[PDB]
């Protein structure tokens, strides 16, 4: 069923964040993990899988539960996600989710998906994100959406953001769900903790899914 839309007091307010916004920004800058048709080479814990991926070396993917790890352990997959280094351990980069079966999931062409951006309840702009996957992780679409908005609207800057609140909403026929784009209030922001929201490996159909971004200004 459908996640209820955020009421205003359920949203993180950037003015309550006194840490370094750069630590959010870098997650949605150019660099990200992207591998095509790879299979896990190892596993550290029961809820992770380890891949050998080229940087241009090893990527630990963490999942929410054992069933996700077991499902993909011996499958050829595509990997797409925002990764981190700080507090990345296994006995070098880490990410959450972002895994899809390769076989039978490829489109012929890249497919454009509208992103509708609202600012203070007003229709601000639209743009496209693209994928060549039938089933794509919400993580992939979220990264692409924010990457565009970082480049073109300075969604995140070094110190802070021009926006007080921001959430991305995914709509799939009847059902919708959303992610808070701002850091939790306080001085601390942990990349590993933030990115863990993607660890459910949530997927959507690129044919049908709609993307909306709601921003408010200060």
């Amino acid at each position: 069923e459908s996640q209820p839309d955020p009421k205003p007091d359920e949203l993180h307010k950037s003015s309550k964040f006194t840490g370094l916004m750069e630590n959010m920004k870098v997650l949605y800058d150019d660099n990200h993990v992207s591998a095509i048709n790879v299979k896990s080479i190892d596993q550290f814990l029961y809820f992770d899988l380890i891949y050998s991926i080229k940087d241009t070396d090893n990527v630990r993917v963490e999942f929410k539960n054992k069933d996700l790890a077991d499902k993909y352990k011996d499958k050829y997959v595509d990997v797409f996600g925002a990764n981190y280094y700080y507090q990345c351990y296994f006995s070098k980069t880490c990410m959450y989710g972002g895994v899809t079966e390769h076989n039978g999931n490829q489109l012929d062409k890249y497919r454009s998906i509208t992103v509708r951006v609202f600012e203070d309840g007003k229709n601000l702009l639209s743009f496209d994100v693209q994928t060549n996957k039938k089933k794509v992780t919400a993580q992939e679409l979220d990264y692409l959406t924010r990457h565009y908005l970082v480049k073109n609207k300075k969604l995140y800057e070094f110190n802070n953001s021009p926006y007080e609140t921001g959430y991305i909403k995914f709509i799939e026929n009847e059902n919708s769900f959303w992610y808070d784009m701002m850091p939790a209030p306080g001085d601390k922001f942990d990349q590993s903790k933030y990115l863990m929201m993607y660890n459910d490996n949530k997927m959507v159909d690129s044919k049908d899914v709609k993307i909306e971004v709601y921003l408010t200004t200060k």
Partner: nanobody
Amino acid sequence: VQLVESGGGSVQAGGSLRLSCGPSGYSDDSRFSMGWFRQAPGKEREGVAVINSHGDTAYADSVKGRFTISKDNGRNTLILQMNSLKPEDTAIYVCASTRAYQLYSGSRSLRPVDYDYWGQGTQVTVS
């Protein structure tokens, strides 16, 4: 917003038709995207050609180099110029448009779900 198509019809293979749509309900400086979709007899609706608010376009592979979408600002018309028509192009063609944005409507989506307004459709037959 209303979308009223004209210029449908029938031609021999190799022929030409020019579809036209005059959108009502927008402001003079509304920034929105517009497209042409078609639905063949027992198939899903498919995006044919789209133009965003600053005039960039995208096309389905099957019509590239044959069909041209354009927007006449002074006449307030969306045009689909259809050349080198094939039997496979037979379908009900329908105009679609989006809500308006302050800054720009950059999207060039060919997915039906991404449009907010739809015309009534006009028959094109090639045979």
